Design a protein around this nucleic acid. Structure first.
Ligand SMILES: [Mg+2]
Ligand SMILES: [Mg+2]
Ligand SMILES: [Mg+2]
Ligand SMILES: [Mg+2]
Ligand SMILES: [Mg+2]
Ligand SMILES: [Mg+2]
Ligand SMILES: [Mg+2]
Ligand SMILES: [Mg+2]
Lengths: 218, 129, 82, 23, 71, 129, 98, 83, 208
RNA sequence: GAGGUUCGAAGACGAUCAGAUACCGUCGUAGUUCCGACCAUAAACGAUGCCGACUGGCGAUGCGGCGGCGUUAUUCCCAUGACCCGCCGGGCAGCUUCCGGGAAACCAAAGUCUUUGGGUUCCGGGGGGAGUAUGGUUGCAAAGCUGAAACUUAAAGGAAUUGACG
């Protein structure tokens, strides 16, 4: 059972906000993993990437503590990456999913060239880069599938990108920032400023502002 | 040396006083067994040790009020101080000490008000590197 | 994003800063959207409606926002001729 | 050190000049 | 930086030419040495006569005798 | 020194629009500048620019909008033979769905789409998208 | 790993600049480098001030001062506790605080 | 910052700009039509002089030259206003 | 805000501004504030344009008023000169106050006693109380401030250019905001002055 | 070639040390000093090629100019000159910041780089072997410059982390 402490939390559980597009729109911090659990019930299948044991050194032996990465996505728009370090593998994983859940974003997908059917690839050639490593996502005509290393494939397959050729380099071994560079790749699809956008925004109220009556609850 | 106080005492002590300022006094053995009433202090050492600050904070209070403290009179006292005010704080009677340039600001406004303006002295500036 | 059948794809259309026309992040938390009221015209009194008004993070952390609030506000007839 | 091996070789080569030039 | 110009097709070619005698993997292949040095004269395998059997001692971390042939 | 007066200018009008600058002037000016900026005007990539006529070279002052992500310049003007035009617009523009390689052919300065309608090649200048 | 942006040195805009040999180790150092105390010690010191002010033939009398420009190489500056050895944030804070 | 109407710069903030940096390059110099006490004759002296400006008459000497503007001699007037 | 007619600057108001010295800025000048100044005198003290000073003041009003629920406006002061002030507009409007320590992520944290997801900050000095501004980067928090000439404008919706130095002047601003925010909508005529004096708004030093 | 103030490789003794052909001492040659030829290298270091464009603050200062508001002086003013307050060019520099960079340390620039090309010079391609051998050349010579391979080798290294020992 909930006890949503955040207002954005409260609004979610009373069928008040209709689709999380209404959150992303206003750039609001999700801070309760259960929110995304309302709003993508089922779907949202969660793949561990790696369990790499870090370990810090001390007067007696080495503190060893695990780092789990988890990827999350619904093969349809939304994906996330969660990195949690803990003393134990099951704690890490369980509590990384909780972050991945939080830090999911939508990916804008576009179109090869002929403007027909449904969106199978990335709009532009976005890049994303995490400390050395960098990953470029090139648009892709249908049927091609994903054309990358395992790890970005496992994040892109999740995003509901169907097709993409990539170009990556740095120290691609270092999985964390194989995956975190190609987090910021697929974040920056929706940051790509194309003509297709280019219309002045109509603008709308806000969840806090429309439903300010229900937050001062009755 | 032997005895500086522990935070089980420092916290409980401060919290009794916050809640029973009127009940306590500046003796030991009185407020000593007030603490037996208003609390469930298990050990005699602690029971007794607590009336430690219960006194050391009354000896402070009469002399002065703590910068951070729990009290009922002080909060009541603070409200009274706030209410008192001059009839007009900013009225400044008639005649403000105004720079000629400040007079210039008014002119752009186009407002007209009483005031003599004085500018004097060399442009010394501020500070001596 | 239409296609053959004028078909509006893309699960949302983002907001877009008023000051830079630059598209405002999904997780750009230093965003704003300032709502500013108008008056009756005669007496005073917010009664009526609303000058909504957004700004990105980058412009905030640059230090501007208020330069770029004014200029918009005084275009929109809220502020006037200082 | 660096300085005292560059100075080793610039003494040692000078011995191969001397050794060589005999023949 | 790089030379970048439009009638610079040589300064470029001749740049990317010599800055291969600093590659290691080509200075095997294109110099001479290799063909001259490897008993296998550029040849995949080769035949030879066993002149004695010699045990070789493996490199420290792994102790053992390796059992080879002088050919 | 000033070798190429585009690269000069286009750096400074990419390099404002990052900062969100409302408008910028471009110091040297040229015909080629004007003629390639007026291309950017049509697809929206900038607003109206107003060229000063200092008696010597020219200055321009470009109204920017938010819309230009980058404009750049291919510095040597390679000769584009129409079969290559694709291979370029593959590896020099973010998608096949927008992005404009401004170049300079037989029939004036223009984007790559307009050289393709007229079926001409010619010399690449730059690209905005 | 440039420790001091400056290089503990205070050159900038030059080249070889006068070397000066220390007042302890006799060790050679640049002028811009090197710690430069300048002591204005009283001659008589704290104790004798009043022995000497009795025995003075003259009346009142200010007494002089030695104006020595001490002038240490960094080695002796650290060994003999003129400066010390600070934290990474602290290394920067160039004020001189009594 | 984010809105400087470069094309219509207020008159003050070109005079605090180096001559060539301005919106249009103009000079920061001038000629002055100079009296001097003896003769009534007026010479057309250029502020930034370089040379010594002698009187059309003879004896007197108008302008010692210095770094920037010219040093007028002792008691003589001038007239900017033109163009 | 740009008071085209009715909500103009008036005369009784101006004399307050002069009396307290709210136009007498600091010696130095953060450039973001060269829109809101006319001269420096000699000595080297900058002079704020009481006209812009006000327009802005209303601009904050328009924005606070905008807030449907008046008790989701955080009102901060860390420096003491506002301490009293903020409590008193907060009581006047029915907004929510923070005097003393901007406490650890009252904007972030779903566990600390204090969080608050307020929809607008108001601050005495951006210079001093400069956490909440920065926490207001992690939530989508607009932000009114009571800037000086020497004040950075990282993270401010809107800057009200003032003194925010001599307690005397500070209060005034916390008044006029309070005043306007109740004139706009609330419960004041426009024609008549307040029951409420300034004297209530600008702190007292140890005095009696 | 001139000269021999000190200091001082080398060099001589005294100590110290298990030893010190080292440091710590006491002597003192070449040289450090001059004038005339060569040599042509530094951690010759901002470990940042040169020219050119663009992008933020804020303080200071050297020079020049410009403007202003000061006055000490300096005289009846002056001219000055000396301080004050500004602006302007180009100099040496400082701080500060989520520009933007940057593996990192850091960097108004190392910024404008998968959003890849303003011009151009040099130059690196795992570590050693090796700056060696050999060849050529310059040099009176130390040496300078040009400059390989077989062989061996898995890391050597850089930036930051905890350790832990000084
Ligand atoms: Mg013989
Ligand atoms: Mg040097
Ligand atoms: Mg000699
Ligand atoms: Mg000795
Ligand atoms: Mg060298
Ligand atoms: Mg570099
Ligand atoms: Mg490149
Ligand atoms: Mg090698």
């Amino acid at each position: 059972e909930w006890m949503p402490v955040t207002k954005l939390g409260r609004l979610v559980k009373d069928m008040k906000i209709k689709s999380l597009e209404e959150i992303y729109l206003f750039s609001l911090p999700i801070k309760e993993s259960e929110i995304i659990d309302f709003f993508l019930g089922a779907s949202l299948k969660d793949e561990v990437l790696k369990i790499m044991p870090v370990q810090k050194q001390t007067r007696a032996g080495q503190r060893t503590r695990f780092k789990a990465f988890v990827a999350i996505g619904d093969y349809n728009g939304h994906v996330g990456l969660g990195v949690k370090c803990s003393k134990e593998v099951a704690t890490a994983i369980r509590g990384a999913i909780i972050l991945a859940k939080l830090s999911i974003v939508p990916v804008r997908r576009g179109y090869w060239g002929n403007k027909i059917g449904k969106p199978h690839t990335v709009p532009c050639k976005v890049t994303g880069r995490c400390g050395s490593v960098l990953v470029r996502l090139i648009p892709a005509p249908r049927g091609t599938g994903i054309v990358s290393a395992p790890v970005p494939k496992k994040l892109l397959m999740m995003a509901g990108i169907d097709d993409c050729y990539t170009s990556a380099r740095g120290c691609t071994a270092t999985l964390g920032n194989f995956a975190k560079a190609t987090f910021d790749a697929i974040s920056k699809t929706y940051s790509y400023l194309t003509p297709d956008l280019w219309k002045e925004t109509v603008f709308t109220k806000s969840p806090y502002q429309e439903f300010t009556d229900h937050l001062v609850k009755t | 040396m032997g005895r500086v106080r522990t935070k089980t005492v420092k916290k409980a002590a401060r919290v009794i006083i916050e809640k029973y300022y009127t009940r306590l006094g500046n003796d030991f053995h009185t407020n000593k067994r007030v603490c037996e009433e208003i609390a469930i202090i298990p050990s005699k050492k602690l029971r007794n040790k607590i009336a430690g600050y219960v006194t050391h904070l009354m000896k402070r209070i009469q002399r002065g009020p703590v910068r951070g403290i729990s009290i009922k009179l002080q909060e009541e006292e603070r409200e009274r101080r706030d209410n008192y005010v001059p009839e007009v704080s900013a009225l400044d009677q008639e005649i403000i000490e105004v720079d000629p340039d400040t007079k210039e600001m008014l002119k752009l406004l186009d407002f007209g008000s009483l005031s003599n303006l004085q500018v004097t002295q060399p442009t010394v500036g501020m500070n001596f590197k | 994003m239409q296609n053959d059948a004028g078909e509006f794809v893309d699960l949302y259309v983002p907001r877009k800063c008023s000051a830079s026309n630059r598209i405002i992040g999904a997780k750009d938390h230093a965003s704003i959207q300032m709502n500013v009221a108008e008056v009756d015209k005669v007496t005073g009194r917010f009664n009526g409606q609303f000058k909504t008004y957004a700004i990105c993070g980058a412009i905030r952390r640059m230090g501007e926002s208020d330069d770029s609030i004014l200029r918009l506000a005084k275009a929109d007839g809220i502020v006037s001729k200082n | 050190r660096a300085k005292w091996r560059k100075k080793r070789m610039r003494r040692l080569k000078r011995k191969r000049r001397k050794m060589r030039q005999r023949s | 930086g790089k030379c970048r110009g439009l009638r610079t097709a040589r300064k470029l070619r001749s740049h990317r030419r010599d800055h291969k005698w600093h590659d290691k993997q080509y200075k095997k292949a294109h110099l001479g040495t290799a063909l001259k040095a490897n008993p296998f004269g550029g040849a995949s395998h080769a035949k030879g006569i066993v002149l004695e059997k010699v045990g070789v001692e493996a490199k420290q971390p792994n102790s053992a005798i390796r059992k080879c042939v002088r050919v | 020194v000033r070798m190429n007066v585009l690269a000069d200018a286009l750096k400074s009008i990419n390099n404002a629009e990052k900062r969100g600058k409302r408008q910028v002037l471009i110091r040297p000016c040229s015909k080629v500048i004007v003629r390639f900026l007026t291309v950017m005007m049509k697809h929206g990539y900038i607003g109206e620019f107003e060229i000063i006529d200092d008696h010597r070279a020219g200055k321009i002052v470009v109204n920017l909008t938010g819309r230009l992500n980058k404009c750049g310049v291919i510095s040597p003007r390679f000769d584009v033979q129409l079969k290559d035009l694709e291979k370029w617009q593959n590896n020099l523009l973010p998608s096949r769905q927008f992005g404009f390689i401004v170049l300079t052919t037989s029939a004036g300065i223009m984007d790559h789409e307009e050289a393709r309608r007229k079926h001409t090649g010619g010399k690449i200048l730059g690209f905005f998208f | 790993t440039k420790k001091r942006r400056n290089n503990g040195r205070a050159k900038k805009g030059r080249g070889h600049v006068q070397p000066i040999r220390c007042t302890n180790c006799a060790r050679c150092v640049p002028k811009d480098k090197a710690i430069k105390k300048f002591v204005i010690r009283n001659i008589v010191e704290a104790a004798a001030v009043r022995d000497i002010s009795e025995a003075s033939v003259f009346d009142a009398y200010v007494l002089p001062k030695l104006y020595v420009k001490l002038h240490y190489c960094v080695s002796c500056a650290i060994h003999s506790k003129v400066v010390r050895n600070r934290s990474r944030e602290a290394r920067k804070d160039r004020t001189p605080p009594p | 910052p984010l809105a400087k109407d470069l094309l219509h710069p207020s008159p003050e903030e070109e005079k605090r700009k180096h001559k060539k940096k301005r919106l249009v390059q103009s000079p920061n110099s001038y000629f002055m039509d100079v009296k001097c006490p003896g003769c009534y004759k007026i010479t057309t002296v250029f502020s930034h002089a370089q040379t010594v400006v002698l009187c059309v008459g003879c004896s007197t000497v108008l302008c010692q030259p210095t770094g920037g503007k010219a040093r007028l001699t002792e008691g003589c007037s001038f007239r900017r206003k033109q163009h | 805000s740009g008071a085209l007619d009715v909500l103009q600057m008036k005369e009784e108001d101006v004399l307050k501004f002069l009396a307290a010295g709210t136009h007498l800025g600091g010696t130095n000048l953060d450039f973001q504030m060269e829109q809101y100044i006319y001269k420096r005198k000699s000595d080297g003290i900058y002079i704020i344009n009481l006209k812009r000073t006000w327009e802005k003041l209303l601009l904050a009003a328009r924005a606070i008023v905008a807030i449907e629920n008046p008790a989701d406006v955080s009102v901060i002061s860390s420096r003491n000169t506002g301490q009293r002030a903020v409590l008193k507009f907060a009581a006047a409007t029915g907004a929510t106050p923070i005097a003393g320590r901007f406490t650890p992520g009252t904007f972030t944290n779903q566990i600390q006693a204090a969080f608050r997801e307020p929809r607008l900050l108001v601050v005495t000095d951006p210079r001093a109380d400069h956490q909440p501004l920065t926490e207001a980067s992690y939530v989508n928090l607009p932000t009114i401030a009571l800037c000086n000439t020497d004040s950075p404008l990282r993270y401010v919706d809107i800057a009200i250019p003032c003194n925010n130095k001599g307690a005397h002047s500070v209060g005034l601003m916390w008044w006029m905001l309070a005043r306007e925010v109740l004139r706009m909508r609330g419960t004041i005529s426009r024609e008549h002055p307040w029951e409420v004096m300034p004297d209530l708004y600008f702190y007292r030093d140890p005095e009696e």
